[PDB]
Amino acid sequence: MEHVAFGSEDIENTLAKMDDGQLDGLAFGAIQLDGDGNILQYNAAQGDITGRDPKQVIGKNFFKDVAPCTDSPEFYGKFKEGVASGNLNTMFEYTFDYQMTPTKVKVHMKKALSGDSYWVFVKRV
Numbered sequence: 001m002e003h004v005a006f007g008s009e010d011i012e013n014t015l016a017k018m019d020d021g022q023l024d025g026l027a028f029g030a031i032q033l034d035g036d037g038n039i040l041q042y043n044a045a046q047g048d049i050t051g052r053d054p055k056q057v058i059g060k061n062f063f064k065d066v067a068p069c070t071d072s073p074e075f076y077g078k079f080k081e082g083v084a085s086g087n088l089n090t091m092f093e094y095t096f097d098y099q100m101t102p103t104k105v106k107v108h109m110k111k112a113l114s115g116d117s118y119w120v121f122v123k124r125v
């Protein structure tokens with residue numbers, strides 16, 4: 001268990017150092033996306049919440065292929081604006097319901113320290 005609290009202000013600084021095995025030790029779900037919304041990292045707790053096998057979704061497009069329910073102004077729209085603006089820091093509640101039991105969560109989207117990468121953090125509410 002990596003001790004990082006959800007919503008921590010310097011969270012992007014802390015996760016820069018972690019490799020994929022260390023990300024799996026977090027208490028919350030973590031998804032790293034590129035600016036086109038392709039999945040670069042997907043940790044163990046996220047596969048717990050969503051039922052997806054982390055290895056099988058890396059490389060897929062989150063908005064197109066994996067999670068069509070987030071293809072809406074309320075989620076995807078915020079991402080596209082953060083990517084275009086080059087800055088992103090937003091938290092909101094949402095319901096995941098594609099091919100799974102409808103599940104309410106707290107989502108935290110934030111730009112990653114690194115280049116063109118963005119974080120999507122998820123925890124149950």
Ligand SMILES: *C(=O)/C=C\c1ccc(O)cc1
Pocket residue numbers: 050051052066067068069070095096097098099100
């Ligand atoms: C909507 O589609 C929300 C999210 C999501 C993520 C992964 C999987 O497997 C289903 C749904």
